[PDB]
Amino acid sequence: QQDKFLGRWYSAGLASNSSWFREKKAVLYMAKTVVAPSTEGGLNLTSTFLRKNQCETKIMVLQPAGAPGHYTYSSSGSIHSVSVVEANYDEYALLFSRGTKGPGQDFRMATLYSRTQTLKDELKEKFTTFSKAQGLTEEDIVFLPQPDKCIQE
Numbered sequence: 001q002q003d004k005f006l007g008r009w010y011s012a013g014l015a016s017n018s019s020w021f022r023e024k025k026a027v028l029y030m031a032k033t034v035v036a037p038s039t040e041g042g043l044n045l046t047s048t049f050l051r052k053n054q055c056e057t058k059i060m061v062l063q064p065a066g067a068p069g070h071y072t073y074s075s076s077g078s079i080h081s082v083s084v085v086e087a088n089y090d091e092y093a094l095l096f097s098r099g100t101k102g103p104g105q106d107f108r109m110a111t112l113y114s115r116t117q118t119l120k121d122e123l124k125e126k127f128t129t130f131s132k133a134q135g136l137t138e139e140d141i142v143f144l145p146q147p148d149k150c151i152q153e
Contacts (some may be wrong), residue, residue, distance in 0.1 A: 002043070004089040008150075009033045011047075012119045013112030015131040015141040020076070021109070022140075027052075029143075030117065030144040032151045036125065040064060042071055048150050055150035073109060075099065091115050092123060094130060108134055117146055117153070 004038035011031045014021070038044045043062040048055060062071035062082060069084040080099040087093035093113040100106040112127045114117075124143060131141050146153060 001089070005087070005093060006035050006037070009093065009113040010117050011111060011114060011144055012114040012117070012122070013141075013143050014109070015111075015127070015134075015136045016107065016109035017136060017140060018107040018109065025142050028142065028144055029147040030151070031147075033113065038062065038064075039046075049145045050150045072145040073097070076101075085110075086126075094127065096130075096134070108136070110134060110136065117151075119143060121152060 009032075011033060014025075014028065016022075026128055029050045031047045033045050036044045036046070038061050039061055042064040045060040045062060046057065048057050048082075052139065060073060062073050064070070065072045065081065071082045073080045076099070078099045078101050080097045082095055082097045085094040085096050088110045092115065095111040095113065097109040097111065098106070099109075110127065110131045112123070114123070127143075128138070128141055132138075
């Protein structure tokens with residue numbers, strides 16, 4: 001079913017306990033991510049985002065991690081283990097990412113992708129719920145605002 005998730009998505013929700021997130025959450029906007037196959041059978045994620053009043057593009061490679069819906073990703077320099085918690089290929093994908101710079105330097109991140117730029121409240125609740133079930137507070141949860149540019153808004 002991986003092929004079902006190819007195509008255009010929008011990062012609409014983000015939650016984490018990291019230092020990065022805590023000190024950059026205020027400047028984060030919704031990004032447009034196009035998904036296609038990766039060399040090793042994983043996924044190539046090409047994202048277009050607003051960094052500092054500028055449209056940037058980055059390519060992330062989710063390497064297969066031994067099972068459908070499980071990937072590894074090189075970030076921080078650290079590596080992350082990404083899993084698809086729940087998803088409907090025509091509507092959304094709830095991803096969970098866990099990393100650890102070392103014993104006690106463990107960070108967690110919940111990401112909500114959407115086929116549309118608009119998010120239904122029921123979907124917002126699911127994200128908040130999953131995020132809290134992971135030890136994340138509301139101050140750690142944010143629904144990414146739609147950028148004016150860099151997306152074909």
